[PDB]
Amino acid sequence: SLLTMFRELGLPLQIEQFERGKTIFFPGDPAERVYLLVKGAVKLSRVYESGEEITVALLRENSVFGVLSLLTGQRSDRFYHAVAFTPVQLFSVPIEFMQKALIERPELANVMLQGLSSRILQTEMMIETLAHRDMGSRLVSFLLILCRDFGIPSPDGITIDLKLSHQAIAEAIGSTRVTVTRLLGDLRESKLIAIHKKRITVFNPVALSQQF
Amino acid sequence: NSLLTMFRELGSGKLPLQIEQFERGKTIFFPGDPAERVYLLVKGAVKLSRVYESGEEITVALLRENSVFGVLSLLTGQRSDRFYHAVAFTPVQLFSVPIEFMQKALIERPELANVMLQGLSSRILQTEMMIETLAHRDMGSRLVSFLLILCRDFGIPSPDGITIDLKLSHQAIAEAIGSTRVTVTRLLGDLRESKLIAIHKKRITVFNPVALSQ
DNA sequence: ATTTTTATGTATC
DNA sequence: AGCTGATACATAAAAAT
DNA sequence: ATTTTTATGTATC
DNA sequence: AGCTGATACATAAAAAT
């Protein structure tokens, strides 16, 4: 629905391309827009003064984001950094176009609430991950998400279909790459995952998610 | 505020909807319970937890007053069942509209849709804000970040500073920030020695939130 | 094809 | 290397009866 | 009011 | 006690020119 609903928000709405690594919005940018991710993945990050980054969200296809604009009151400015972790296609409705269309087609409000509901549950899902202690468990919990979100079927299990640098992972699970490398290595030795061409394939993903 | 007013008027009959009172410790919903309701927290704090087979718990959300929760219901397409444990970390008071009453009233009074979207939007941001917390490494920083939230969320003014108005056991904290209670004790002890916080009757009073941040 | 920047592996502490 | 978990045990505070 | 279960302080590695 | 961060350096893969 979301995809269909967002198309009709206007002449119709054209998609925007962003190339891998291009910023969808910067800290400071007025929160005047709501987005729908259609193709690709988007990385929501907090950027500390030191230039260092922490990942808050690796949004999956069909995700509503830029949600701070939906809040009424003093015009708010972005505080996270939205970047195209893959090549991505989104819609970028201005906030006032949206508000209008929620009044005219109340069906869009039901569909919108559902998407925000999934965002809350997906983000909580992530808290569960970080709330582990063992960085091996934290990593595995993270991978089991990425399997659910970006994974395609493989002979033995699911291959996480996106290019994940160990650094990118480290930023997502509150660790450092050398730990992420080391740990991923340990999964490889245990024969729980396998990597070819920077693509992590977890075996029996069902069996790992049972351990929680 | 609107939410509160909006939720009041979602009554079964002509009379408004009554609050439900839950005592400290009583479960608002259990894993398995059909997700057929959306809630508004009014007075208190709700602990959303995941309970592993071993009896062990992880806290996902310590929701603050005026929070919308029970949102798996809002997501239709499948009659899903609850997977988290909603419990009153404090004496709480909520509204509990059935999901079909809500859906109807979003179409009839579109004003409530805007107010609902705002509420769920605040949830997303609040939950991310928590990710930021956990995504630290230093458990002292993680703890402090956690407390600075609780100051924003549950804090009332005191002569010395902001008192986080909720009884927090070190265990409860440990579950919230992915640690253990002996670490939480030890760490909180360190704050006490440094004279950055003080605890009376299980209530943590931060003296200068910005001083802790430093 | 020739750099140069990024990603990964391993060891130590 | 340096936290923090694991394990321990004393003792105080809260809950239950 | 007692008793018992839980919470906290502290130590070790 | 033991993970895991900090630091280090080698080396491979990818991007940029």
Ligand SMILES: O=C(O)CCC(=O)C(=O)O
């Ligand atoms: O809305 C923002 O500016 C940040 C939060 C966000 O992008 C989202 O999770 O929807």
Ligand SMILES: O=C(O)CCC(=O)C(=O)O
């Ligand atoms: O909606 C659920 O059933 C679990 C998550 C939740 O309660 C919420 O955060 O709204």
